[PDB]
Design a protein around this ligand. Structure first.
Ligand code: GTP
Ligand code: G1I
Lengths: 281, 54, 333, 232
């Protein structure tokens, strides 16, 4: 049963991400500045679903890591790299939507394909500098008896960090983008209300749930998927024995599930539906 | 009143012409198409050696 | 005034007496052409806005296109290389032409004037050579009779023959009621036909300057007109989703090309080198290939994401070029 | 052999200039000026300045490009497909010509024809109801009455939301709002939410007619983006 569920999750993630990527690549009407960020987000989710999930599933089911310590370190590094680079792209998408509405006249000059490429490489470099660099140089390892013993054991693959890294990585990956997204979407909601109020005043007699039904979905899925884990990450390092090891993995997998929802949230436009009808059937 | 006269004069110059039967005209068109069907790259595909766009 | 009704009755009676058979009744045993499948070979990019006009060269290698952004680019089909790019004084451009000798290019639009550009002469950068004025309405089409004379049609319900050296209307043609939308020249350049917005097509004489015949079979404005390679027939297409073939000698319609699953307009028509295939562009984002002698569809051209507004076939009949509002050109084979 | 390399040199130079022109093309807004006739288009053009005719004016470092087609005069408009991708259409109508020969009904018919076109299905209209003082004069004077030419005016009453300017007579504002609602009804009936209408009361002495267009275009672009992102 557990294997069936995990295989279904892997298949769903891979299918959705591959479909979105090939739909963007095949056609020319879907190649705009906005779709580049969506392409980058779809890449990380595919790499996440293709690499991280199968090996974590095998480690959970077998209850024993059957590879060397090098592979465990590499797997942890790519896990952090994929998680970091996926959240930070949603912030970029939100900022682009913010600039498209509040300043409509200067939006064309503000963002260009070259600027989009520069931003994407900057995001990926920042994501890579916080995952491979501190892990491969062994700057994140803990210094207690269980951590040392399990590092020594060749069959371990477990997570043990000190306070500084567990705080810094969590802050960079989650907490900085959250404030930006909140501010952006609040301002967008205010602009929508202003326009709706103008329309009603001008021509109301002849004739805000629409904005809520979208913004609430967008923010709620992300928050409910990634908040509990990034709270318990700080909690279990702040004080010991409060958080069991079996809840850390559960919350982490709940966060992993979010990779399979992004294509539904961000690719529901009529153009994407038409493109999907062509490639499929 | 001149416009009516101009139209009437024009109608008289397009009714006094020598017309042929539709059968002969259709036969002529069919014969031309059949004769020149050999030299039609779109109708009969040309080999890739002679194709300049491939 | 009532004499016109009697005169028109005599014309209909004679035209009814001539028709003793149907084009379909004699081209009934002809084997069909089958199915024709064409694939895109080239795609030309560089226009910032939608495209209205396009014209091939007599060398079957170079072509010109016009766009609403205010430019006029000359392409190289074989290598996909831009050769020239002429900025236009007025952005709104509706037509373009390419000279038979390859030394000039015409232009025109909503400014009511026609401009002639000099390409292969002593011009490192292309510069305006002449400007022809005198129309009181927007231009619709223009074709080069020679290196010194040109014929144009406008929304003034009139067509004119110009002299580039002096810049005056040598001959003017009158008789249409609505705007003239297209024209085409005969291979010998002695007669030409035009299609207007009053659902009527007329046959003109270049030297004499007087109309000869009138054909009326459409229910709406005629948008495109093409001329049979033989020189004794022509085909038109209107925005009621019908193409019709007329015969000059018989002075009547021969066959109509329509289907019940299409209801959009028609923007362009063109024949093939032999004349067996009729290619027509529609508002349904695509193009259709017809059988001239049987009125049966033989294929379909798809790949454009907006209206198809231009269509042309090379002089050697080797390739087909289509322009669209998606600011792209495609070559089919 | 060297011929192929020679052509690519000219291709690179041409493609460099096309990049500069794309920046200008996407940073400018095109407006179409349309009027019924004897409405006051020339005066409206004159105040913003301070075949075909084009004017340039820039407000708040934004470039606008206005077109006035006057060479083509006909009752049928087949050139109107050329303006599929304009930002807005400016419609000018003389509000005081409700009795002279009816010109107001002809303007309403023209507006209805423009609104329901198959190609202008995503273009908003900025409406300028011109000649306000003549209307006020001939309404205050009892020489003529509106209900003689528009029977529906008898049963019409001013709405509670109306805010007349100080010192204005109730009859004048009733007439103004009736004429405005005559256009607003046509605008609202067939609209699907993809394009609206922005009506304004203008005059010869007005000087703020260049800010109204700026504000309306900003609203148009903002609403288009909001609708695109499924927020409106
Ligand atoms: N009192 C008054 N008169 C105006 C106003 N606008 C225009 N007029 C007058 O109306 C006359 C005709 O208006 P024009 O400014 O010529 O506009 P137009 O060229 O007639 O407009 P079209 O006929 O549509 O081209 C002019 O002589 C103006 O003086 C206005 O706001 N108030
Ligand atoms: C073992 N799983 C890791 C553990 C810690 C961690 C993750 C993701 C992003 C971060 O910034 C982290 O610090 C998780 O994917």
């Amino acid at each position: 049963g557990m294997g069936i569920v995990m295989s279904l999750i892997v298949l769903a993630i891979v299918f959705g991400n591959v479909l979105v990527i090939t739909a963007i690549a095949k056609f020319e009407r879907l190649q705009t500045v906005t779709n580049y960020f969506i392409t980058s987000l779809a890449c990380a989710d595919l790499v996440m679903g293709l690499a991280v999930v199968p090996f974590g599933a095998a480690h959970i089911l077998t209850k024993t890591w059957t590879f060397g310590n090098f592979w465990c370190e590499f797997w942890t590094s790519i896990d952090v790299l994929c998680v970091t680079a996926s959240i930070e792209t949603l912030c970029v998408i939100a900022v682009d939507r913010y600039f498209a509405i509040t300043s409509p006249f200067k939006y064309q000059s503000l963002l260009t394909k070259n600027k989009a490429r520069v931003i994407i490489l900057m995001v990926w470099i920042v994501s890579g500098l916080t995952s491979f660099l501190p892990i491969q140089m062994h700057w994140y390892r803990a210094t207690h008896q269980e951590a040392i013993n399990c590092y020594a054991e060749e069959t371990c693959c477990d997570f043990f960090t000190n306070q500084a890294y567990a705080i810094a990585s969590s802050i960079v990956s989650f907490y900085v983008p959250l404030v930006i997204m909140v501010f952006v979407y609040s301002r967008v909601f205010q602009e929508a209300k202003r326009q709706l109020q103008k329309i009603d005043k001008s021509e109301g007699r002849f004739h805000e749930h629409k904005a809520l039904k979208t913004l609430g979905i967008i923010m709620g899925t992300f928050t409910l998927c990634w908040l509990p884990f990034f709270i318990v990450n700080i909690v279990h390092v702040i004080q010991d024995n409060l958080i069991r090891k079996e809840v850390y993995i559960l919350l982490n997998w709940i966060g992993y599930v979010n990779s399979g929802f992004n294509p539904l949230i961000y690719c529901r436009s009529p153009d994407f539906r038409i493109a999907f009808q062509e490639l499929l059937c | 009143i001149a416009q009516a006269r101009k139209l009437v004069e024009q109608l008289k110059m397009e009714a006094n012409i020598d017309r042929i039967k539709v059968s002969k005209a259709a036969a002529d068109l069919m014969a031309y198409c059949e004769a020149h069907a050999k030299e039609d790259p779109l109708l009969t595909p040309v080999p890739a050696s002679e194709n300049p766009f491939r | 005034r009532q004499e016109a009704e009697q005169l028109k009755n005599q014309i209909r009676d004679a035209r009814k007496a001539c028709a003793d058979a149907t084009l379909s009744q004699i081209t009934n045993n002809i084997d069909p052409v089958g199915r024709i499948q064409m694939r895109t070979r080239r795609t030309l990019r560089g226009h910032l806005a939608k495209i209205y006009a396009m014209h091939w060269g007599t060398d079957s290698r170079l072509l010109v296109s016009a766009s609403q952004d205010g430019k006029l680019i000359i392409w190289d089909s074989y290598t996909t290389n831009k050769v020239h790019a002429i900025p236009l004084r007025s952005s709104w451009v509706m037509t373009c032409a390419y000279a038979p000798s390859g030394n000039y290019v015409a232009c025109g639009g909503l400014d009511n004037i026609c401009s002639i550009y000099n390409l292969k002469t002593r011009e490192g950068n292309v510069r305006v050579s002449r400007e022809l004025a005198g129309h009181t309405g927007y231009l619709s089409c223009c074709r080069f009779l020679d290196d010194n004379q040109i014929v144009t049609s406008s929304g003034d319900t009139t067509c004119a023959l110009w002299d580039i050296e002096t810049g005056q209307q040598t001959t003017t043609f009158t008789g249409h009621t609505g705007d003239v939308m297209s024209l085409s020249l005969a291979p010998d350049t002695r007669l030409f036909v035009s299609g207007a917005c009053d659902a009527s097509a007329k046959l003109w004489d270049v030297r004499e300057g007087m109309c000869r015949q009138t054909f009326t079979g459409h229910e709406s404005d005629i948008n495109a007109i093409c001329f049979f390679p033989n020189g004794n027939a022509f085909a038109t297409g209107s925005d009621d989703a019908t193409c019709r073939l007329f015969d000059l000698r018989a002075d009547q319609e021969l066959m109509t090309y329509s289907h019940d699953n299409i209801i959009c307009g028609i923007t362009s028509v063109s024949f093939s080198k032999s004349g067996r295939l009729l290619l027509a562009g529609y508002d349904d984002f695509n193009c259709n290939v017809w059988d001239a002698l049987k009125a049966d569809r033989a294929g379909v051209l798809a790949g454009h994401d907006n209206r198809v507004s231009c269509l042309g076939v090379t002089d050697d009949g080797m390739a087909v070029a289509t322009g669209s509002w998606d600011s792209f050109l495609k070559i089919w084979n | 052999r060297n011929e192929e390399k020679a052509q690519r040199e000219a291709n690179k130079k041409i493609e460099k200039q096309l990049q500069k022109d794309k920046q200008v093309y996407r940073a400018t807004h095109r407006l179409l000026l349309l009027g019924a006739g004897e409405s006051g288009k020339s005066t409206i053009v004159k105040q913003m300045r301070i075949g075909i005719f084009e004017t340039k004016f820039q407000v708040d470092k934004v470039n606008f490009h206005m077109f006035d087609v006057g060479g083509q005069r006909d009752e049928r408009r087949k050139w109107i497909q050329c303006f599929n991708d304009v930002t807005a259409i400016i419609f000018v109508v003389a509000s005081s010509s409700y009795n002279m020969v009816n010109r107001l009904q002809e303007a309403l018919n023209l507006f209805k024809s423009i609104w329901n076109n198959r190609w202008l299905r995503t273009i908003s209209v900025i409406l300028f109801l011109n000649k306000q003082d003549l209307l006020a004069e001939k309404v205050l004077a009892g020489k003529s009455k509106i209900e003689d030419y528009f029977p529906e005016f008898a049963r019409y009453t001013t709405p509670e939301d109306a805010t007349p300017e100080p010192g204005e007579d109730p009859r004048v504002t009733r007439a103004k709002y009736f004429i405005r609602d005559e256009f607003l009804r046509i605008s609202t009936a067939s609209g699907d939410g993809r394009h609206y209408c922005y009506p304004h009361f203008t005059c010869a002495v007005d000087t703020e007619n260049i800010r109204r267009v700026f504000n309306d275009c900003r609203d148009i672009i903002q609403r288009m983006h909001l609708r695109q992102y499924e927020l409106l």
